[PDB]
Amino acid sequence: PQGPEVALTADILEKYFKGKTLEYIDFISGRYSKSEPEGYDDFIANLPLKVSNVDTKGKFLWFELFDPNDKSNKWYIWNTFGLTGMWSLFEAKYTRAVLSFDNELMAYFSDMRNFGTFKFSNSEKELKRKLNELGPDFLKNDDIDISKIKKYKQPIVALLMDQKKIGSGLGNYLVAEILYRAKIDPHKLGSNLTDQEIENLWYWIKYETKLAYDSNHIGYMVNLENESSKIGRKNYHPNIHPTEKEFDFLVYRKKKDPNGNKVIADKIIGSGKNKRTTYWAPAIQKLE
DNA sequence: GTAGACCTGGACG
DNA sequence: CGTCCATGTCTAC
């Protein structure tokens, strides 16, 4: 899941668990049932703890907890989703982690491919340094300066997929959709973009991330599509107003764009076993 | 630049 | 059976 999906997940987790007391956390299958997460023993020794917040930056999510009788003792749960990670209020297929709160209340993290990660820390300083490794959140930061793009002689698609250089939160499908809307050839070097293209790009980044965030069932958040329709949406990018009422793929994994133009499944980024497919329509997206 | 890996499928032939 | 693809990210020549 990308930035918008992680942010919405955090919103739902806060709605149901902020203020609740976590009593236990179990890794019933997957990587962590085979080898425990960093800081796990330390953490379980300090439970029960109360959840004060569930926040996100880009595709990174974390829980902040503390003991009511020692507000100073703050603990954190670091979580990344990988390609198939998801949270749910019910024990879905592929459930890896089970969090037990007071009063029989439960939260579950499922992950088919086990690429998601968990880390437990008692250091606010370590979390801060972690957050500083990520660029500003494309969905939550309404005043990002993307003109920094002009300093890089690299394909714009690669710059937007990077989680530090310009901003954080964009993944394979969002970048493809954004570039199509902005009418920019994915191969174009950031150092060759005009100020007008940059202004345009910023607009569509805000448009697409907000649309994705406001959606209820784009696809990979099925275990919560029920909750997505029962919770509101924070007013990120307040001045941008998408017309569609649900996110839809214009080019990602499509043979043709909405108007019949051929879509190329291009291999631009990566090498070896990490190559990604970049979907774009040349009749629309130009280098100039 | 290049290569590999972690893991478990779904879709298609 | 077989093939390719998959909303992520890391490590090494």
UniProtKB/Swiss-Prot annotation:
SMART domains linked to this entry: Fapy_DNA_glyco, H2TH
EC number: 3.2.2.23, 4.2.99.18
Keywords of this entry: DNA damage, DNA repair, DNA-binding, Glycosidase, Hydrolase, Lyase, Multifunctional enzyme
Record's catalysed reaction(s): Hydrolysis of DNA containing ring-opened 7-methylguanine residues, releasing 2,6-diamino-4-hydroxy-5-(N-methyl)formamidopyrimidine; 2'-deoxyribonucleotide-(2'-deoxyribose 5'-phosphate)-2'-deoxyribonucleotide-DNA = a 3'-end 2'-deoxyribonucleotide-(2,3-dehydro-2,3-deoxyribose 5'-phosphate)-DNA + a 5'-end 5'-phospho-2'-deoxyribonucleoside-DNA + H(+)
CDD domains for this protein: FpgNei_N
Gene Ontology biological-process annotations: base-excision repair
N-terminal signal peptide: none
PANTHER family noted in UniProt: FORMAMIDOPYRIMIDINE-DNA GLYCOSYLASE
Family classification: Belongs to the FPG family.
Name of the protein this chain belongs to: Probable formamidopyrimidine-DNA glycosylase
Species this protein is from: Acanthamoeba polyphaga mimivirus (APMV)
